[PDB]
């Protein structure tokens, strides 16, 4: 019985932005969650709808892994029923969530000399994101009452903004890699279990 490639998402040399959060499908393997909970390398390991102790000796049909990078101050927003620029516009979680959230510091990897301005985030949307929805649209946002046919102007700006991610930053503005596991059991055989 092959193990789950979890070191494939947690040790993924590159991560994605929040407006384009990568999604992995994990199945046909055995996963040891007790190793990840006691790793002491994650600053935040919060679970919803599932007891992490009882999570190891449990089975699911398909588990999704969403990975992205945010500010330290915005790790609070990756949770069910949150409000903010991330939860409303970047990555939303459903009220009936049955998956965990795992975040850790990544200053050495995602912040270099002179800054690392390659991670982006959504700043404007005409409506809030639905649960597990993604929006990568670079359509200029109509902040005012005057329309704009995809042309920059007053009250019409680019909806994407880059993080600073300087090495000598504060913790709340430091790069933090976060992976959200989704535990879904549909009408299918359970194939991801633990020891």
């Amino acid at each position, epitope marked *: 019985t092959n193990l789950c490639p979890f070191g494939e998402v947690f040790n993924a040399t590159r991560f*994605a*932005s929040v407006y*384009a959060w*990568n*999604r*992995k*499908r994990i199945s046909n393997c055995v996963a040891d969650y007790s190793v990840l909970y006691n790793s002491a390398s994650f600053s935040t390991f919060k679970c919803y709808g599932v007891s992490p102790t009882k999570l190891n000796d449990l089975c699911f049909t398909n588990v999704y892994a969403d990975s992205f990078v945010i500010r330290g101050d915005e790790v609070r927003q990756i949770a069910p029923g949150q409000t903010g620029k991330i939860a409303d516009y970047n990555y939303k979680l459903p009220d009936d969530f049955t998956g965990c959230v795992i975040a850790w510091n990544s200053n050495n990897l995602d912040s270099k000399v002179g800054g690392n*301005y*390659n*991670y*982006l985030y959504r700043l404007f949307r005409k409506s809030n994101l*639905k649960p597990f*929805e*993604r*929006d*990568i*649209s*670079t*359509e*200029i946002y109509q902040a005012g009452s005057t329309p704009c046919n*995809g*042309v*920059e102007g007053f009250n019409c700006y*680019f909806p*994407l903004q*880059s993080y600073g991610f300087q090495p000598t930053n504060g913790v709340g503005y430091q790069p933090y890699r976060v992976v959200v596991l989704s535990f879904e059991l549909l009408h299918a055989p359970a194939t991801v279990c633990g020891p």
Partner: antibody, heavy 117, light 109 residues
Framework: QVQLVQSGAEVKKPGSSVKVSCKAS????????ISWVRQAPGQGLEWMGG????????NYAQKFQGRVTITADKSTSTAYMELSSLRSEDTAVYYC??????????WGQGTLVTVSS | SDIQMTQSPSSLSASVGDRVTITCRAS??????LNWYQQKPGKAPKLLIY???SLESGVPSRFSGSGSGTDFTLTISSLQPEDFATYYC?????????FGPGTKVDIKR
């Protein structure tokens, strides 16, 4: 009035590299992204990569790392897609296209790239 | 894991004045992030309809898109001699960007 002009067709030996240029005009550069897709002879469209000139962030397809690098020159309104260590499978016509977020509304002329021994 | 796009039918044959309807399906839900492109031999693709529901500038009104989640359909009110070409659907909801196999359209005889 949006219009994109690509470089001329080039012939390369296997293992060499090619650099396709694309000059955009008729619209506000840096306010839109730019993408690249190739079409093999008698086959579908295969997305190469996408780059946003606003922040220079580049994203490539699943297996084009170490092979493709897409750059953008904001001053010249020109985006350059470069594919190295070319093989016979990579022979195709490469299309430059103004890339909005969830769609592509304006396409370039294309540049045929033939790589044979 | 990426996302694959499928179309149907693989090849259709109709004539001028007919009502042609093409379909497109995705692996995972993409909401309103599907686009349709028309490519003629020797030329580049043109954006027919963006967001799977809205019409793009310079496209006649006979073109119409619909769908949500994973199922989408592109329909034409009446076919025209300039409408005979190959059509594709793409997803703009995630990375990497993926297209469909394609759908060729020729005139009936």
């Amino acid at each position: 009035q949006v219009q994109l002009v690509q470089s001329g067709a080039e012939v390369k030996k296997p293992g060499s590299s090619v650099k396709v240029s694309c000059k955009a005009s008729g619209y506000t550069f840096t306010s839109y992204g730019i993408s690249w897709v190739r079409q093999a002879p008698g086959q579908g469209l295969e997305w190469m990569g996408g780059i946003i000139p606003m922040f220079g962030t580049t994203n490539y397809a699943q297996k084009f790392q170490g092979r493709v690098t897409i750059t953008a020159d904001k001053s010249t309104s020109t985006a350059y897609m470069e594919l190295s260590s070319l093989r016979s499978e990579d022979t195709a016509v490469y299309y430059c296209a103004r890339d909005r977020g969830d769609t592509i509304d304006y396409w370039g002329q294309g540049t045929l790239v033939t790589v044979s021994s | 894991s990426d996302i694959q796009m499928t179309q149907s039918p693989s090849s259709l044959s109709a004539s001028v004045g007919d009502r042609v309807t093409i379909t497109c399906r995705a692996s995972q839900g993409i909401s309103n992030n599907l686009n349709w492109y028309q490519q003629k031999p020797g030329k580049a693709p043109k954006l027919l309809i963006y967001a799977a529901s809205s019409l793009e500038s310079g496209v006649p009104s006979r073109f119409s898109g619909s769908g949500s989640g994973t199922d989408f359909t592109l329909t034409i009110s009446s076919l025209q001699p300039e409408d005979f070409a190959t059509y594709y659907c793409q997803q703009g909801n995630g990375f990497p960007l993926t297209f469909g196999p394609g759908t060729k359209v020729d005139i009936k005889r």
